[PDB]
Design a protein around this nucleic acid. Structure first.
Ligand code: SF4
Ligand code: MG
Lengths: 1153, 261, 261, 261
DNA sequence: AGTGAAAAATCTAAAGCATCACCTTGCTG
DNA sequence: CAGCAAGGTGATGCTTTAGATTTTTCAT
């Protein structure tokens, strides 16, 4: 036991001496000091009594450029649940059982979320168990977790048995919670410390603990010392770089815009010098050059450089996967331990953090949360898209060619990736995360690496502790679940947004399209447009009608437009594309509707709330569709067969293990075996075992909770709009300052401007991540009912808007975010208003937006809504709100919809809409580019999209699409006659990633497994044994009759000596009767032809066939269902009924018997 | 209190097999003169009525024109039960809500009894007068199935054209076409193989032959079928089922236009 | 050395055709008494017993008891080669890892030797009590197969009543309850097409139709199948083989508890 | 027009029913010898020969050696009018691309045309080698099929050995190896049961079990299969349609790299 | 250029159903 | 004494489905 304490104190001394050699002077002298917090880590620090005790050392930066650190010790703790009248006994027992391990145990009340009758004043009395140190916390938690688990199981069984009949002392513990919450999270929650704030640290002597306080009036943000290191190894071609044999020749890093590159001499043949690279004036850096004969002196030079610079923030691309393990092993070869010089250490999560430094990964940001496409979340595409320049790139497979002969190219590539990750960090990522952690209570390491679920978790953590709310523990995936019908479950969900594309084709402002039109809806519009504009003025602008002068004039102008449109109830007219995107329905629906997960009760649980008067006002009823897959095994049969399986014993997992009874197996393996036997039991007694059921369910949402979730999203979007207006005024100030041309005030204004942008982007992104948190599991505030209710109410609103645009035009595309429509231009959308307000003289209100606003106001405004007004006397005021705001888009120039190849099934989130000036506007969830995809269809598909806007009618625009389609089919039917072979060979590569040696899949045949066997028989087995390799391959045609997996020939057969390549292809061809060895012939030309054909079927021809237009290209066939619908549509002999064509005898319906 | 006895239950089996896949709900109605099938099909394109008259039942008795609305997509499973020659006793009541079926073995060894549940319906009824038809053709049922069901696969629509030479079936589809020509026979000895045609004027009607593929499966009822048609009027397919009654398919043609050029 | 001849191959085709669809394994017991296959199926709620007595085979002898548990689906897959008239033979050793099956034609020309990989599993002999059954009824196999396929459409369970007069099948469902009553047909000289009952006391037992539809897969095995049932006693389908032994299908009757009544 | 005349149409529909699976689309050659087609399967590894001589037909009318591009899957949906005894009529095609198909019932009172257009199917030409083969096994095809279908569903590959004491069909596959042996028949005079093997030297050939499953799906067309082989040459499977037609299966020999010996 | 696990969607072989052609057999001219 | 129609039987195309498999989607 003393050896572990010795190891921990040695580790603490190592971290302290590391901090002192990086300038973080531990505050021991008394007095005040200003600081700006940058990091947070738990580290055991001995107290005054020379006793073990945990602490967290905050790191502070000062504006003069001098850092320091401050340790603060506190007692780690959680809360446990106790039975009524059982608070003193359990505390006394656990204090006496672990004297010297528990600092303080006591009771403290916190309001819970699930307790019956809870909204009248009573509160739940929890008990804190606080320890001296975090390892004591871990030991006690793992000691108590099985005990409380079995206690929960036994009290659940006893309560169920008693309720069925009627209608280590540790007998009082019920449920222990907030166990997986980290220590520093708990401190940053309790004592209210975040990062990126200014604090007045006070420390008088060593007896008193350090005192810290927020000081937010110093809104200027200092610059931490940042450093952007990326590496490169001695990689031989067609090989994963080795973590032992390979070693660094070239790194670069960016210390606050100052470049330093470090290079070796045994690899680089001639020395390199300083240079400057500037693609944009904002990106620059002078690259200091260090040259050393040996790589040990390379790593020592880097070590002493970061010792003399002391960089608090270090940033890298794929640090936790490739950089740190490689440099750690490579330094351990030369006997320079990484846990003694820099600080970063191998943690239990597979990640790397230093006690004092920050380790950052821009890949995880640009993948998780930048909302860029999954197909291009690497660093080069982020440099092209976000930062807007083309980064310098080089093929890693042939880096040894210019390791000596062109070292300048290698140096340029290394410094270019370094400067790209550095500037991408400081421009977007750094202020974004620090704005995030203004309200997120953790260091940038974790909050960068966690998911959006954990960020929303931290937000609700903060405001739940503020509102004195005990947390729910993470949910338990309780198997053997049975619903009301008494069946076992396989998978159950809510229903998502039914994202469809009700029709497809080409829709442009210039093109005159059809309008089938119901005059009744325009009778309603003629009788309602006055109220429509009245509501638009009084609610959207929040201005009463008395402050406008030309109201009657614009109203009668709309009357004339609507009447002139009405006079012809069927048109061929030029539309405008009009994007009815209310914009993130889900937060708006939670705001309007007040979905709180605390009560959200059902029947027989609603009666607990004591203010449920017969005038039911809190009874918000909503509908959603529960779907579930179940086996038909009812309660009786499943009960019988579970006793049947209980009767005998079970095979032990351990070899030669003892027999175990039914009560001491793990739940997961017994559930797996029970499901396995029940599947082939019911397979021969019911004729069906996988039965889906999608039923309608009504759930009630309590309307008078303490309501932290709706309050957070409301006040949080409120601060979103406040910071958006602040960014607007400060961007006006920035434009004025850059027109004036001063030096320091423009710098301060730009600092505040990027501060406000990072704030508002962080707020917006976490607002549209509040839905991602509640959508899936792995969350404490996880309710299925929010996801179902919000998703189906969003679908309900979006489909009512669909049906109310169907009678006034041809709505276009239906989504779970917002409709796209095309409207007749005879509808008004803009005019010049004359209002009495001098500051705002003009009002521009789009009339269709106004009518959708008024109909959502009539239909889906919460009239049941409640609110607190005064807490002591339970004053609940009844209000009404509706923030579901259909903000609309301008008339877009073009829009193209794709269609599927299956009847009934419709595409999920696939379309394209174009920008008015002539460029592109928006894609979504679409096949422009994707990992593991052939490159031919991407370039074809982008070419078709970009060669599109010329045309005058539907036949003309489909002819212009057919022009580029005919060009591509001409250059692809020519079998690559006069086009470069390298471009095609890169164009038709297909790459599949394989890892986990060879035993992951077991015994199965896929294309990746077939290519693994092909490389196994190629030259050796070691090229298949090592994991994490992406194999590139092409489908051939010559072995006809084999399945698709066998014909996937890799490309290593294309990269050898030609004669032995011929030998390999004769081996893999199973014949030798040929004499030619052409590369173009072996390729499966028709396979790529039919893949491009399937793409153009999805994109062009089938979307054409759902319209009354000619087939666009006759050079491709069609699906048989499409061909028969096309042949059946155009016959006048099609259908004549009998009810309207011949006289019916009358009305008659059958009665009883 | 409805009772219908039938010594030849195979024809009831065959009529209720002949229209299971056509209609969804069975709008039967019993009366003193006989039982009628005033059922409206779901696709709402054609009409079929069965008329079982009192001269064919072994014991037929009714009280009034009671309408029966049992589901018929649940019906050709009870009527797949009895053998080819059992004795069928179909019973109903004026006040009880359970239809009854009783099948008796010919040698009296396997008696079966079936109950039923009842429910209401709501669907229109068509009324067609007795109008005189231009061309009437008499066809053996087996040859009628051989032509109809087997042109149903090459084609989707059929053209029934009657001229002075004879009746023809010009059915086209997605691959080709079939032009069935008929020749007159006069020196015939037996009526189940005799084809005789009543001529008034040349006519031509287009039909969805898919519905005739539904329709022709009543071949083993009566060995002779009569097809009568005029211009712009539902063609009648009439099966005279062995002096039990008759089954009529009124199928609506499709109007002719000058789409040739 | 184990050499077993049998002139007729029909019965030792149909026994394992009936055993094929219900059991996926086997535990062969070759003893001096004959051949046994006492097996459980996947559900472990029913028992199957193939008994082939030694004297039924023309030439059959043993020297020790063997318990060799090859699966049964593979055997009934491989043994379908010959016909129902072919002469069958099994050849094995005292410690054979793979047995052989010879199928000689009636003209002694088409001669086989078919072998398969063998494994072993848990071999257990559960209690087979020949308790005095309350109701034992013998019906022709064709009629019983027809009535089980008949009642499988209406519902998923049949309740069987044994009385002084005879047997009463009944099947309830959404098509309505259908009941089929058979009395003793002792008026014919053919016992193959007759039904015979022996009776102690009336009981009413409901059975699951997927398992009866798997039991009665042995349609051609016997001219008459007898089945015995008693209060809370498993149904014993006693497939009688005129050549040797028998086949036994034991099923525990499903009776619903008071969870809904 | 131009459909070959024959009083029966059983063969004309059943050969296309059997050929419909292996070959999707092919071309038909008419010459003074008769009708012929050489076709390849989907994977282009096996050849199928059908020769039906004009002198083997009733009587012959033609204009020239002509190749017709008619598909074999959708066109084999109109041939179910022509039963086992329906009569065709033949006449020269003058200038139209349409091939008809007239069907005459034995009553000689109802005709039916079937007009099909022509699409161009380009088929390669080659010369099939002919040589003296080591072993030819002539044996009735019904039992050939009922043995092949039951040794082919357990395995995936087959090895045939031609031996004097017996030709051996080793079924190499996952479940196990099983084999059939055929001696010389000496006590059966009737051709419908006897097996003969005209063989000179032993040889082993390897083939696919699925291919031998699909090849022998033309059993009602013929009565006796002959399998002809030599030292590592493609199998030649002969069916004879009376004395008027012959069909040949010519699948390539899939001999591995000295795996057999 | 992380992995890691769930999972909803997708692909493919196995089973259930009604249908089609054939074999067997009894009644009658 | 054989011709012919009725009943039973086995093969088969088709549709449904159950289990493996694949890409997605968020978790560290
Ligand atoms: S619906 Fe009303 S009464 Fe029911 S729990 Fe919610 S607030 Fe209380
Ligand atoms: Mg990197």
């Amino acid at each position: 036991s003393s050896v572990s304490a010795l190891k921990r104190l040695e580790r603490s001394q190592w971290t302290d001496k590391m901090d002192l050699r990086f300038g973080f002077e531990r505050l021991k002298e008394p007095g005040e000091k200003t600081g700006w917090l940058i990091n947070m880590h738990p580290t055991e620090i001995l107290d005054e009594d020379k006793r073990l005790g945990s602490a967290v050392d905050y790191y502070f930066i000062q504006d003069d450029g001098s850092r320091f650190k401050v340790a603060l010790p506190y007692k780690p703790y959680f809360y446990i649940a106790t039975r009524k009248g059982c608070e003193r006994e359990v505390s006394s027992f656990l204090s006496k059982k672990f004297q010297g391990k528990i600092a303080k145990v006591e009771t403290v009340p916190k309001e819970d979320l699930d307790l019956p009758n809870h909204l009248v004043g009573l509160k739940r009395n929890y008990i804190r168990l606080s320890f001296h140190t975090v390892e004591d916390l871990v030991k006690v938690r793992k000691e108590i977790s099985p005990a409380v688990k079995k206690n929960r199981e036994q009290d659940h069984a006893s309560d169920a048995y008693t309720a069925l009949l009627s209608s280590d002392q540790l007998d009082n513990i019920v449920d222990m919670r907030e166990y997986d919450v980290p220590y520093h999270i708990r401190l940053s929650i309790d004592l209210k410390i975040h990062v990126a704030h200014w604090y007045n640290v006070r420390y008088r002597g060593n007896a008193f603990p350090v005192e810290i306080t927020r000081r937010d009036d110093l809104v200027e943000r200092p610059d931490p010392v940042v450093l952007a290191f990326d590496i490169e190894t001695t990689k031989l071609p067609l090989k994963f770089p080795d973590a032992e044999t390979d070693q660094i020749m070239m790194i670069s890093y960016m210390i606050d815009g100052q470049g330093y590159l470090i290079t070796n001499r045994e690899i680089v043949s001639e020395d390199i010098e300083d240079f400057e690279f500037t693609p944009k004036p904002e990106y620059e850096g002078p690259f200091c050059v260090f040259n050393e004969p040996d790589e040990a002196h390379l790593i020592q030079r880097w070590f002493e450089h970061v010792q003399e610079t002391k960089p608090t923030i270090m940033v890298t691309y794929n640090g936790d996967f490739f950089d740190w393990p490689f440099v750690e092993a490579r330094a351990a070869v030369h006997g320079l331990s990484m846990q003694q010089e820099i600080g970063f250490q191998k943690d239990s999560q597979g990640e790397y953090k230093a006690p004092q430094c920050i380790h950052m990964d821009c890949l995880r940001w640009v993948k998780r949360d930048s909302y860029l496409p999954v197909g291009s979340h690497n660093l080069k595409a982020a440099a092209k898209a976000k930062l807007g320049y083309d980064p310098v790139e080089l093929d890693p497979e042939d880096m040894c060619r210019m390791a000596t002969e062109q070292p300048q190219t290698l140096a340029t590539y290394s410094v270019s990736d370094a400067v790209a990750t550095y500037y991408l960090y400081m421009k977007y990522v750094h202020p974004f995360i620090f704005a995030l952690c203004t309200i997120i209570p953790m260091e940038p390491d974790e909050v960068l690496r966690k998911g959006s679920g954990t960020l929303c978790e931290a937000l609700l953590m903060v405001q739940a502790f503020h509102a004195n709310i005990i947390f729910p523990n993470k949910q338990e995936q309780e198997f053997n679940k049975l619903t009301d019908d008494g069946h076992v479950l396989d998978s159950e969900t809510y229903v998502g947004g039914h994202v469809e594309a009700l029709e497809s084709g080409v829709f442009r402002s210039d093109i005159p399209c059809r309008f089938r039109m119901n005059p009744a809806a325009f009778d309603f519009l003629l009788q309602r447009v006055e109220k429509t504009l009245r509501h638009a003025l009084e609610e959207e602008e929040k201005v009463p009608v008395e402050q406008v002068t030309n109201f009657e004039e614009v109203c009668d102008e709309i009357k004339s437009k609507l009447a002139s449109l009405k006079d012809v109830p069927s048109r061929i007219e030029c539309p405008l594309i009009y994007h009815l995107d209310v914009g993130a329905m889900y937060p708006n629906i939670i705001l309007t509707n007040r979905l709180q997960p605390s009560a959200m009760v059902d029947e027989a649980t609603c009666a607990a709330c004591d203010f449920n008067k017969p005038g039911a006002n809190c009874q918000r009823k909503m509908a959603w569709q529960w779907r579930g897959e179940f086996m038909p095994a009812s309660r009786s049969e499943y009960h019988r067969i579970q006793h049947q399986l209980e009767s005998e014993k079970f095979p032990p997992l351990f070899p030669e293990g003892p027999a175990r009874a039914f009560h001491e197996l793990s739940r997961e393996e017994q559930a797996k075996y029970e499901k396995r036997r029940l599947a082939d039991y019911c397979r021969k007694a019911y004729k069906k075992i996988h039965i889906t059921k999608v039923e309608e369910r009504l759930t009630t949402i309590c309307q008078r909770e303490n309501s932290f979730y709706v309050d957070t999203v409301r006040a949080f979007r409120d601060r979103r709009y406040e910071f958006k207006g602040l960014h607007k005024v400060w961007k006006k100030k920035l434009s004025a300052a850059v027109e004036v041309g001063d030096a320091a005030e423009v710098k301060r204004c730009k600092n505040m401007e990027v501060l406000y942008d990072s704030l508002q982007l962080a707020h917006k992104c976490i607002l549209n991540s509040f839905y991602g948190y509640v959508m899936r599991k792995g969350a404490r505030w996880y309710s299925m009912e929010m996801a179902g209710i919000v998703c189906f109410t969003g679908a309900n609103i979006i489909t009512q808007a669909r049906e109310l645009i169907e009678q006034i035009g041809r709505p276009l595309e239906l989504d779970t975010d917002g409709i796209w429509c095309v409207l007749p231009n005879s509808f008004p959308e803009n005019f010049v208003f004359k209002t009495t307000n001098v500051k705002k003289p003009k009002v521009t209100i789009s009339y269709p937006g106004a009518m959708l606003n008024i109909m959502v106001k009539e239909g889906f405004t919460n009239d049941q809504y409640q609110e607190l007004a005064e807490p002591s006397s339970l004053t609940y005021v009844t209000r009404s709100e509706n923030s579901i705001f259909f903000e609309v888009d301008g008339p877009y120039l073009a829009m193209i919809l794709p269609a599927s190849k299956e009847e009934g099934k419709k595409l999920k989130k696939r379309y394209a809409v174009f920008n008015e000036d002539g460029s592109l506007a928006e894609l979504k969830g679409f096949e422009v580019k994707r990992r593991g995809e052939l490159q031919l269809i991407k370039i074809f598909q982008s070419s078709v999209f970009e060669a599109f806007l010329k045309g005058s009618t539907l036949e003309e625009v489909y002819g212009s699409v057919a022009k580029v389609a005919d060009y591509w089919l001409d250059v692809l039917y020519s079998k690559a006659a006069n086009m470069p072979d390298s471009e095609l060979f890169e164009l038709i590569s297909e790459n599949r990633s394989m890892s986990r040696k060879l035993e992951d899949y077991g015994e199965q045949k896929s294309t990746s497994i077939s290519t693994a066997k092909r490389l196994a028989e190629f030259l050796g087995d070691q090229m298949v044994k090592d994991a994490g390799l992406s194999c590139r391959y092409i489908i051939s045609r010559k072995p006809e009759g084999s399945p698709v997996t066998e014909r996937a020939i890799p490309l290593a057969i294309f990269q050898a000596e030609p004669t032995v390549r011929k030998h390999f292809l004769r081996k893999w061809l199973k014949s030798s009767s040929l004499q030619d060895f052409d590369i173009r012939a072996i390729l499966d030309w028709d396979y790529y032809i039919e893949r491009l054909g399937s793409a153009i079927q999805k994109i062009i021809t089938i979307p054409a066939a759902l319209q009354q237009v000619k087939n666009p290209v006759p050079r491709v066939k069609h699906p048989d269902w499409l061909h028969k619908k096309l042949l059946e549509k155009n016959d006048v002999y099609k259908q004549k009924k009998i009810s309207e064509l011949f006289t019916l005898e009358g009305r008659r319906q059958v009665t009883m018997a | 209190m409805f009772e219908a006895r039938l010594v030849q239950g195979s024809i009831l089996k065959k009529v209720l097999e002949a229209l299971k896949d056509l209609i969804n709900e069975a709008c039967w109605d019993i009366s003193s003169s006989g039982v009628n099938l005033q059922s409206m099909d779901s696709s709402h394109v054609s009409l079929v009525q069965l008329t079982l008259r009192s001269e064919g039942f072994d014991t037929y008795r009714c009280d009034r024109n009671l309408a029966m609305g049992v589901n018929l997509t649940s019906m050709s499973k009870i009527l797949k039960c009895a053998g080819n020659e059992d004795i069928i006793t179909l019973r109903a009541e004026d006040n009880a809500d359970t239809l009854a079926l009783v099948f008796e073995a010919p040698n009296q060894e396997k008696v079966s009894d079936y109950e039923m549940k009842l429910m209401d319906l709501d669907v229109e009824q068509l009324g067609i007068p007795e109008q005189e038809y231009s061309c009437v053709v008499k066809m053996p049922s087996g040859e009628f199935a051989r032509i109809c069901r087997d042109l149903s696969h090459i084609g989707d629509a059929v053209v029934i054209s009657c001229a002075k030479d004879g009746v023809k079936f010009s059915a086209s589809g997605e691959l080709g076409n079939g032009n069935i020509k008929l020749s007159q026979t006069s020196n015939v000895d037996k009526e189940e193989e005799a084809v005789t045609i009543e001529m008034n004027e040349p006519v031509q009607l287009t039909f969805a032959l898919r519905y005739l593929n539904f329709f022709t499966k009543a071949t083993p009822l009566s060995s002779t079928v009569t097809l009568s048609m005029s211009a712009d009027v539902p063609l009648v397919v009439e099966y005279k089922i062995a002096d039990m009654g008759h089954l009529k398919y009124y199928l609506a043609p499709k109007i002719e236009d000058e789409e040739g050029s």
